[PDB]
Amino acid sequence: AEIYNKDGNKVDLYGKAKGLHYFSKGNGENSYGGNGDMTYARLGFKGETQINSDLTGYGQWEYNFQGNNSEGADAQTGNKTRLAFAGLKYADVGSFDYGRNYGVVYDALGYTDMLPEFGGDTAYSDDFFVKRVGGVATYRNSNFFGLVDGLNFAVQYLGKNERDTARRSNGDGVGGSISYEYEGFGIVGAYGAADRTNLQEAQPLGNGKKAEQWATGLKYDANNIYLAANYGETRNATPITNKFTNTSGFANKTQDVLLVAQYQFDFGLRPSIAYTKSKAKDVEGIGDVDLVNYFEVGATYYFNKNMSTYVDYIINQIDSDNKLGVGSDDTVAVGIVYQF
Amino acid sequence: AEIYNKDGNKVDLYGKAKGLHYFSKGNGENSYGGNGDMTYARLGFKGETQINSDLTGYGQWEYNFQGNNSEGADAQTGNKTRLAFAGLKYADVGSFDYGRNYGVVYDALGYTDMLPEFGGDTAYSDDFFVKRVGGVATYRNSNFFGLVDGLNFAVQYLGKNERDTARRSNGDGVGGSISYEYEGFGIVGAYGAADRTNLQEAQPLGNGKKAEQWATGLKYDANNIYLAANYGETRNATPITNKFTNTSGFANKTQDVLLVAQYQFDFGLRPSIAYTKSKAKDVEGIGDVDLVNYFEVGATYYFNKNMSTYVDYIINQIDSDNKLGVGSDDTVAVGIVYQF
Amino acid sequence: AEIYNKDGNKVDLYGKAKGLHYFSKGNGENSYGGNGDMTYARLGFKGETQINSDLTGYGQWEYNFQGNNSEGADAQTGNKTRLAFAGLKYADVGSFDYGRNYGVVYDALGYTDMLPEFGGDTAYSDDFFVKRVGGVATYRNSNFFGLVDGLNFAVQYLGKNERDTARRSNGDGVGGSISYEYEGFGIVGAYGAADRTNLQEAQPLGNGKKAEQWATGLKYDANNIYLAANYGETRNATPITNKFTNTSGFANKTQDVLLVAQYQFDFGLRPSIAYTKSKAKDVEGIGDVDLVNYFEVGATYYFNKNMSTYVDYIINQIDSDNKLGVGSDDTVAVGIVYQF
């Protein structure tokens, strides 16, 4: 909610409180999404200042407060900053910003990152360019310098982040995206490549010196309809764990596909149909193994701009012999959301 | 403070900064409340949206920031979310909400949960239904569907929370409360029962498969006077530690009593007299042992709605041979509070 | 930003989002400031209530959210409360407040604590009276009871904080400051002494029962110019580590000097020149060793009150044989700041 607008500066203070619960069978462990209470809240700010008529500064910070821990020792489980960056926007030359922010390949992956609760399985965080990263410098240009309406692009510089863990680390790398939008249609191409850290190189699964990720996207978004499709591939970048062995590393290659179709009724209801499949190839020891495979059915009902409710149902297609240990049971989530 | 009120939505952003210090003797350890700096701050939001004339949505999140840790390694000690939930309120049918929230037996226990700094000793958190829990679904009805003024009730569903620790865990359980209020008098009954987790069952102190808690409350709140009394019992639910042995578990039964009397002067002063006693029965190895036993004397001085100060003095009646290791020295707390 | 002003109460909600990166050579380790992403955000509140015409209450809380951790396990690294206190201000008698706050010797040290990114090296936190501490009671008087314009003083009571670590601990102690300001000139004297905890006493470096710190300050702040100088000494209080041995404790004595000169152009640019040196004497095993020694060159460019950018360059004078292990390579920091 915009709580401040004085002398050039507008501040927006936003957040949500989401009561959420997942119903899986068994112990949750062989199930898609797990099982039990999954409540959380969110809180962030979004500021913007008019430095002059062609020049804007802006900043953003967003945090996640888990709502399913006790008030003892486990208190902080899963609490974290999702976003923290500052930048400048100048007339038709472009914007530039630095900080923790969305990587360039998510410029494509967000097309299908629209289910009520699940989806966007290939857009992991702290995973090079596919979702939120730390340390990126991003340059974005709109409408080709003011010359071609709807033609945009971006380039992004990722700096090395040598963490304690191979999963949350990364060497230096560059990415970019090009996209075009016209009368409800949109098409996108994104691509990035990076160096893998020494600790990444020592993991038992995956071999190579460079991480790579790309995706393509197509969408029709108009007249209350939303249909979208994504297709992408990666070499050495997606995190995988062998649950039998307890080994870990990255998949040599993945070929990913995600399709979504939604409809917005005028009275508040938004049904969703979706399909997802992600498969790893040349996995040291295993061969071709599906990481993700399902059908999704769900609906959201918007009481207004601040209140909503939802059911999200995953008909998991993974099967019970999957060689990595990927679970095969379905999962249902029911949620009630207040936001401002 | 209500910082936002536009188009149906009202947002309230609230918090406090409390400088607090406790004076006990010795090393604090044989003392009621401990000794030294105990400063903290609080911050939360409370949102409400008018979906139509009979229909409201609402949400809440509240956090606790300890103010007595260093800026090193110990930084987060005792930081946590106290509340996180969302819900709907519909005309005279009732409200329903889900999330981390106050359990149903606190509907009774809050009567006496009114001292400046201490008190409400039997209302522990993450302890089934007596204070804040995670994962509860709560249904509350006011004025019996609009038919009887001042007659209210609630039912609450608690879902299993299998944590790392027996103290912060719980199986599934149900509770309810009934209460009546008329011309400054109020009476209440609450009751809940639950399953105990496997890890609870393995603790050395306490035996059984079900946790139970109930309390009764009576109050007179009018003409600046506040008098209130609570009486409750529990089987297998209250956490106890044997300090000699270092063993732990739950008390087989407790019989709890709490009485309070306050007065609100018109110039700002609010004196408080209180009495508290909590005793465990059939404690494996020990027998009947008092957990809590004291007299309280204290005063709060309200400078206004935002500023106040207080002294809270505990004349501890526990004695120096107590068989569980319960401390027996008094404790004094002095505090200065800013809130908005 | 002042988001609330109703019925006596004014609330200010403030914060920043700072994209920051340091460029050192090597592995960062033999370098002044280290190397890589160092982004963070900040968020705090500042409240004030008019209790009557001579009487004000106030409170403050401020937090630090690191922006350079992943969304896994390392999530909280370096997150903490910097400030949390409440107090009262009464006409010309003085203010009094309690909580986590700036210690009295920083009344002097802040003179030179003005570089874009670096500086103020002798003002460590949780280090007795030189920067932010926990548990202090502070009394401050302005203009000598209304009698002498510009003559101020303060007394501060520090209570024992027995933490897990010698570095973040402290016994009881008292401090004070006296200062005078006239037509752009200001002079200051601060002094405090404390008891050292048992764990402090057991560290291999440093010997004694009392910690002491003092500093003097001189400044000219007018007509867009800022020149300032600080001189201070400490006995047994500054934390030092021998990097060879891996031993730790406090320096027997330090003689500290800090000088700064800045200029504020009217178009937005603020160049900065600075010099710093801190040296420990009678270090058990070593003798006289420099802890800090450098030259600083930098500039900040203010786009407005909310947006700015900076470069801060440290020409490190420490040398490559330094006996404690102090690094000797330079460091450059580049930052972009949004604040409200």
Tab-separated table of C-alpha atoms in Angstrom, chain A residues 1-226:
chain	number	residue	atom	x	y	z
A	1	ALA	CA	0.000	0.000	0.000
A	2	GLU	CA	1.339	3.413	-0.940
A	3	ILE	CA	1.811	4.977	2.507
A	4	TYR	CA	3.963	7.910	1.471
A	5	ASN	CA	3.989	10.397	-1.388
A	6	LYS	CA	5.783	13.674	-0.649
A	7	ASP	CA	8.198	15.977	-2.514
A	8	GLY	CA	9.232	13.612	-5.302
A	9	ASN	CA	9.356	10.420	-3.175
A	10	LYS	CA	6.648	7.697	-3.168
A	11	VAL	CA	7.119	4.773	-0.691
A	12	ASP	CA	5.069	1.549	-0.901
A	13	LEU	CA	4.836	-0.725	2.174
A	14	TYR	CA	3.517	-4.152	1.256
A	15	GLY	CA	3.039	-7.572	2.836
A	16	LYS	CA	0.823	-10.625	3.214
A	17	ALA	CA	-0.369	-13.132	5.825
A	18	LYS	CA	-1.094	-16.551	4.244
A	19	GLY	CA	-2.654	-19.428	6.211
A	20	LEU	CA	-1.642	-22.529	4.192
A	21	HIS	CA	-1.752	-26.265	4.675
A	22	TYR	CA	-0.741	-29.156	2.402
A	23	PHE	CA	-2.478	-32.554	2.310
A	24	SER	CA	-0.318	-35.417	1.038
A	25	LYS	CA	-0.480	-39.023	2.101
A	26	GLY	CA	1.950	-41.045	4.046
A	27	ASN	CA	4.728	-39.185	5.833
A	28	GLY	CA	4.777	-36.481	3.112
A	29	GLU	CA	8.221	-37.688	1.950
A	30	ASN	CA	7.112	-39.680	-1.125
A	31	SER	CA	4.696	-36.882	-2.148
A	32	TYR	CA	5.137	-33.879	-4.410
A	33	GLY	CA	4.791	-30.978	-2.008
A	34	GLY	CA	5.053	-32.509	1.488
A	35	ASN	CA	2.378	-32.392	4.214
A	36	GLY	CA	1.097	-30.165	7.040
A	37	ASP	CA	1.152	-26.506	8.065
A	38	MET	CA	3.055	-24.177	5.720
A	39	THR	CA	1.896	-20.712	6.802
A	40	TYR	CA	4.071	-17.663	6.203
A	41	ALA	CA	3.983	-13.870	6.079
A	42	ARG	CA	5.865	-11.442	3.831
A	43	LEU	CA	6.886	-7.794	4.226
A	44	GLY	CA	8.760	-5.451	1.886
A	45	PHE	CA	9.208	-1.874	0.751
A	46	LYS	CA	9.356	-0.363	-2.743
A	47	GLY	CA	10.593	3.271	-3.002
A	48	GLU	CA	10.853	5.638	-5.998
A	49	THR	CA	12.190	9.183	-6.300
A	50	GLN	CA	11.827	11.653	-9.156
A	51	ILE	CA	15.323	13.210	-9.339
A	52	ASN	CA	14.190	15.272	-12.309
A	53	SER	CA	11.877	14.720	-15.237
A	54	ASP	CA	14.017	12.166	-17.107
A	55	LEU	CA	15.593	10.655	-13.978
A	56	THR	CA	14.353	8.139	-11.395
A	57	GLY	CA	16.075	6.330	-8.497
A	58	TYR	CA	14.433	3.315	-6.854
A	59	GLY	CA	15.061	0.629	-4.278
A	60	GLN	CA	13.567	-2.610	-3.009
A	61	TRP	CA	13.724	-4.970	-0.076
A	62	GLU	CA	11.449	-7.948	0.647
A	63	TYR	CA	11.513	-10.495	3.446
A	64	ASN	CA	10.004	-13.836	4.252
A	65	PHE	CA	8.854	-14.796	7.709
A	66	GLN	CA	7.912	-18.497	8.042
A	67	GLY	CA	4.660	-18.947	10.066
A	68	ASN	CA	5.153	-22.687	10.839
A	69	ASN	CA	8.026	-22.809	13.382
A	70	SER	CA	7.669	-22.872	17.235
A	71	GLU	CA	8.798	-19.951	19.431
A	72	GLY	CA	11.845	-21.969	20.574
A	73	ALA	CA	15.133	-22.980	18.877
A	74	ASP	CA	13.631	-23.639	15.407
A	75	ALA	CA	12.256	-20.094	15.274
A	76	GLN	CA	14.165	-18.841	12.192
A	77	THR	CA	13.723	-21.873	9.929
A	78	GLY	CA	13.363	-20.665	6.379
A	79	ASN	CA	13.490	-16.951	7.112
A	80	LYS	CA	15.330	-14.889	4.512
A	81	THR	CA	15.662	-11.795	2.324
A	82	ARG	CA	14.333	-12.513	-1.160
A	83	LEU	CA	15.168	-9.119	-2.668
A	84	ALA	CA	17.512	-6.197	-1.844
A	85	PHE	CA	18.641	-3.796	-4.586
A	86	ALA	CA	18.926	-0.151	-5.661
A	87	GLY	CA	19.048	1.432	-9.123
A	88	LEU	CA	18.519	4.342	-11.572
A	89	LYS	CA	16.106	4.751	-14.525
A	90	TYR	CA	16.928	7.320	-17.181
A	91	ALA	CA	14.477	8.513	-19.831
A	92	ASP	CA	14.724	6.222	-22.862
A	93	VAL	CA	18.344	5.096	-22.278
A	94	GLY	CA	17.538	2.256	-19.854
A	95	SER	CA	17.596	1.315	-16.161
A	96	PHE	CA	20.592	-0.085	-14.245
A	97	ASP	CA	20.487	-1.729	-10.783
A	98	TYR	CA	22.657	-3.800	-8.455
A	99	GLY	CA	21.893	-6.203	-5.563
A	100	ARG	CA	20.028	-9.444	-4.848
A	101	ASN	CA	17.420	-9.701	-7.666
A	102	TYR	CA	15.801	-11.979	-10.301
A	103	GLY	CA	18.319	-13.457	-12.771
A	104	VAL	CA	17.902	-12.902	-16.515
A	105	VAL	CA	16.599	-16.402	-17.564
A	106	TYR	CA	13.518	-15.858	-15.290
A	107	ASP	CA	12.528	-13.235	-17.866
A	108	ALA	CA	11.296	-16.318	-19.761
A	109	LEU	CA	10.459	-18.707	-16.941
A	110	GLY	CA	7.929	-16.384	-15.330
A	111	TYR	CA	5.540	-16.936	-18.263
A	112	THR	CA	4.495	-20.229	-16.775
A	113	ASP	CA	5.296	-19.262	-13.154
A	114	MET	CA	1.620	-18.546	-12.439
A	115	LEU	CA	-0.036	-21.459	-10.554
A	116	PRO	CA	-1.949	-20.704	-7.325
A	117	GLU	CA	0.511	-22.548	-5.133
A	118	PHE	CA	2.775	-24.890	-7.151
A	119	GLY	CA	4.635	-24.686	-10.481
A	120	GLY	CA	7.767	-22.946	-11.800
A	121	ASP	CA	9.766	-26.019	-10.741
A	122	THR	CA	12.801	-25.202	-12.938
A	123	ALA	CA	13.159	-21.680	-11.473
A	124	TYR	CA	15.243	-22.494	-8.333
A	125	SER	CA	16.931	-19.799	-6.207
A	126	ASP	CA	20.631	-19.255	-5.779
A	127	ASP	CA	20.942	-21.294	-9.012
A	128	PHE	CA	22.811	-19.048	-11.484
A	129	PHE	CA	20.213	-17.126	-13.613
A	130	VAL	CA	16.851	-18.928	-13.287
A	131	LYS	CA	15.485	-17.205	-10.147
A	132	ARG	CA	16.670	-14.919	-7.311
A	133	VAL	CA	20.457	-14.538	-7.069
A	134	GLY	CA	22.910	-12.447	-5.091
A	135	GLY	CA	25.370	-9.991	-6.604
A	136	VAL	CA	23.920	-9.236	-10.063
A	137	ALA	CA	24.290	-6.038	-12.087
A	138	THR	CA	21.356	-5.690	-14.471
A	139	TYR	CA	20.864	-3.394	-17.463
A	140	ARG	CA	17.391	-3.322	-19.050
A	141	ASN	CA	16.253	-1.368	-22.105
A	142	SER	CA	12.610	-0.779	-23.117
A	143	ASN	CA	11.229	-0.181	-26.583
A	144	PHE	CA	14.678	-0.127	-28.175
A	145	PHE	CA	15.751	3.298	-26.990
A	146	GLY	CA	12.227	4.657	-27.640
A	147	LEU	CA	12.483	3.562	-31.298
A	148	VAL	CA	10.528	0.269	-31.584
A	149	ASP	CA	7.420	-0.106	-29.390
A	150	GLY	CA	7.380	-3.410	-27.460
A	151	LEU	CA	10.899	-4.630	-28.270
A	152	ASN	CA	12.919	-4.964	-25.064
A	153	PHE	CA	16.238	-6.511	-23.977
A	154	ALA	CA	18.535	-6.892	-21.016
A	155	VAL	CA	22.100	-7.840	-20.156
A	156	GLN	CA	23.132	-9.107	-16.726
A	157	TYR	CA	26.498	-9.549	-15.051
A	158	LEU	CA	26.711	-12.210	-12.335
A	159	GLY	CA	29.678	-12.038	-9.919
A	160	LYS	CA	31.213	-15.066	-8.185
A	161	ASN	CA	29.607	-16.064	-4.876
A	162	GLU	CA	31.810	-18.641	-3.189
A	163	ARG	CA	29.541	-19.933	-0.405
A	164	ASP	CA	29.975	-22.832	2.062
A	165	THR	CA	27.897	-25.148	-0.091
A	166	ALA	CA	28.096	-26.222	-3.699
A	167	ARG	CA	24.310	-25.784	-4.125
A	168	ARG	CA	24.314	-22.070	-3.195
A	169	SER	CA	27.518	-21.042	-5.021
A	170	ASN	CA	28.528	-19.607	-8.430
A	171	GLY	CA	31.463	-18.285	-10.463
A	172	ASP	CA	31.288	-15.168	-12.695
A	173	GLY	CA	28.926	-15.294	-15.694
A	174	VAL	CA	26.851	-13.198	-18.139
A	175	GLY	CA	23.306	-13.443	-19.410
A	176	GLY	CA	20.809	-11.614	-21.587
A	177	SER	CA	17.237	-11.751	-22.797
A	178	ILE	CA	15.401	-10.399	-25.862
A	179	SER	CA	11.607	-10.102	-25.994
A	180	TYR	CA	8.769	-8.813	-28.091
A	181	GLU	CA	5.167	-8.034	-27.196
A	182	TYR	CA	2.281	-7.183	-29.494
A	183	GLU	CA	-1.505	-7.104	-29.011
A	184	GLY	CA	-1.573	-9.730	-26.243
A	185	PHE	CA	1.149	-11.922	-27.764
A	186	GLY	CA	4.613	-12.094	-26.284
A	187	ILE	CA	7.713	-14.059	-27.237
A	188	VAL	CA	11.018	-14.349	-25.283
A	189	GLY	CA	14.575	-15.696	-25.472
A	190	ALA	CA	16.971	-15.614	-22.479
A	191	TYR	CA	20.445	-17.140	-22.091
A	192	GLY	CA	23.255	-17.092	-19.526
A	193	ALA	CA	26.547	-18.903	-18.840
A	194	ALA	CA	28.823	-18.964	-15.816
A	195	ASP	CA	31.910	-20.429	-14.182
A	196	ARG	CA	31.368	-23.243	-11.643
A	197	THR	CA	33.194	-22.964	-8.316
A	198	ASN	CA	35.781	-25.466	-7.104
A	199	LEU	CA	33.342	-26.916	-4.587
A	200	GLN	CA	30.767	-27.373	-7.384
A	201	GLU	CA	33.480	-29.136	-9.403
A	202	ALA	CA	34.155	-31.587	-6.517
A	203	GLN	CA	30.555	-32.869	-6.278
A	204	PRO	CA	30.006	-36.475	-7.308
A	205	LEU	CA	27.195	-35.691	-9.813
A	206	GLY	CA	27.970	-33.645	-12.949
A	207	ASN	CA	31.133	-32.738	-14.849
A	208	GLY	CA	32.427	-29.582	-16.471
A	209	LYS	CA	33.769	-26.052	-15.988
A	210	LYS	CA	30.821	-23.911	-17.112
A	211	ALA	CA	27.170	-23.716	-16.141
A	212	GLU	CA	24.599	-22.937	-18.846
A	213	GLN	CA	20.841	-22.256	-18.863
A	214	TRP	CA	18.381	-21.123	-21.538
A	215	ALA	CA	14.612	-20.971	-22.053
A	216	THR	CA	12.048	-19.808	-24.601
A	217	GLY	CA	8.572	-18.477	-23.925
A	218	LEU	CA	5.312	-17.832	-25.744
A	219	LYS	CA	2.151	-16.245	-24.374
A	220	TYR	CA	-1.318	-15.005	-25.129
A	221	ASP	CA	-2.601	-12.695	-22.405
A	222	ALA	CA	-5.806	-10.820	-23.236
A	223	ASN	CA	-9.625	-11.028	-23.036
A	224	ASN	CA	-9.425	-12.746	-19.653
A	225	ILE	CA	-7.483	-15.697	-21.047
A	226	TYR	CA	-3.951	-16.678	-20.139
